Design a protein around this ligand. Structure first.
Ligand SMILES: Nc1nc(=O)c2ncn([C@@H]3O[C@@H]4COP(=O)(O)O[C@H]5[C@@H](O)[C@H](n6cnc7c(N)ncnc76)O[C@@H]5COP(=O)(O)O[C@@H]3[C@@H]4O)c2[nH]1
Lengths: 181, 188
């Protein structure tokens, strides 16, 4: 079989999702900030943060296993598209809040490498993950309204487990984006 | 610039949708029937019927596509935590197929999403992806997905692929008639 899938994953993810949700994301975050102004506190960073584990290990547990990343609130809105606001903690204390999620199509790359078909090893998976990343960034580089409204967080380590701190990785990105504004 | 997307679309649709939605479909249909069979009626056909128009953009709505296709009811939603989204929602719908002014069939029915992706790609204004390219990628997407499913016995027993051309110059074609022919061949 032909396992050159990265280009299809990138265009699927852009055309079928980022192109659809990124234009209205800032307004949904501002709507949330206004609804909950006197109560819940506000989200200053209006970008979508997309976690991109190159090992394609994408959890579905809302990061319950990582106590420094905690689901805070749904970002609300036929097909339904919703997003998630997460709290980041550092030294046990709150440290950040942002709209955050994983690049779901990495789970397709994971299943292909696990599904025990031949001709698609873990190294083949990593090469497809990188090409998926590069193609997506090339697509986003020519859609400046999309590039304005999302940031990819790419990393090599297991997303959960071991000494790598995903919360610190996300926090570092938030502070970088803070410098840009 | 590299618009060879069909292979990725097929694997993504299989892993990220069919493998996720098909195992729970029968229970959702059973729940629908227990709630509705005594008034609205029940659904005897428990398979997901997926439409693959090869040579025409995916209509945004089935009743628009064919006046002989009428929305009946949604199934209970499938909700699941997914890649950081809490309770991501997957919805599926039952349609009735009309013939000569009477309902003639009822089934869970939808379009294959990647064909909509391909259509949007050809309409986005970028150079190098014409209707000709779209048609070639649509056939390859269908072929690849069928190749994958021929290795997936459980899935292929729980969905049915309805693949068809459409005429563009007034040759007779009824989408409901095409679906009905498939439904009546499944009862064998
Ligand atoms: N009929 C149908 N109903 C659905 O709910 C659905 N969800 C996905 N799909 C299609 O199955 C395949 C796999 O989806 P995956 O989630 O792995 O990639 C998805 C996913 O990464 C992202 N995405 C789409 N919708 C959502 C969503 N509600 N929440 C988060 N991410 C989403 O954008 C990618 C492409 O989405 P679609 O372009 O709508 O087509 C998909 C795709 O062809 C669906 N098809």
């Amino acid at each position: 079989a032909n396992f050159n899938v990265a280009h299809g994953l990138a265009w699927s993810y852009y055309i079928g999702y980022l192109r659809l949700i990124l234009p209205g994301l800032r307004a949904r975050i501002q709507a949330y900030n206004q609804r909950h102004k006197n109560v819940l506190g506000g989200i200053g960073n209006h970008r979508l943060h997309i976690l991109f584990p190159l090992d394609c290990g994408v959890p579905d547990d809302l990061s319950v296993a990582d106590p420094n990343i905690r689901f805070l609130h749904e970002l609300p809105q036929g097909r339904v598209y919703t997003n998630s606001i997460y709290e980041l903690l550092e030294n046990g204390q709150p440290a950040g809040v942002c709209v955050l999620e994983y690049a779901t199509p990495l789970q397709t790359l994971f299943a292909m490498s696990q599904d025990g078909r031949a001709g698609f090893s873990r190294e083949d998976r990593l090469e497809q993950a990188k090409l998926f990343c590069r193609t997506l960034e090339d697509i986003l580089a020519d859609a400046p309204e999309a590039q304005n409204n999302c940031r990819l967080i790419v990393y090599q380590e297991p997303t959960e487990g071991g000494s790598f701190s995903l919360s610190q990785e996300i926090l570092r990105h938030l502070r970088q984006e803070e410098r840009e504004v």
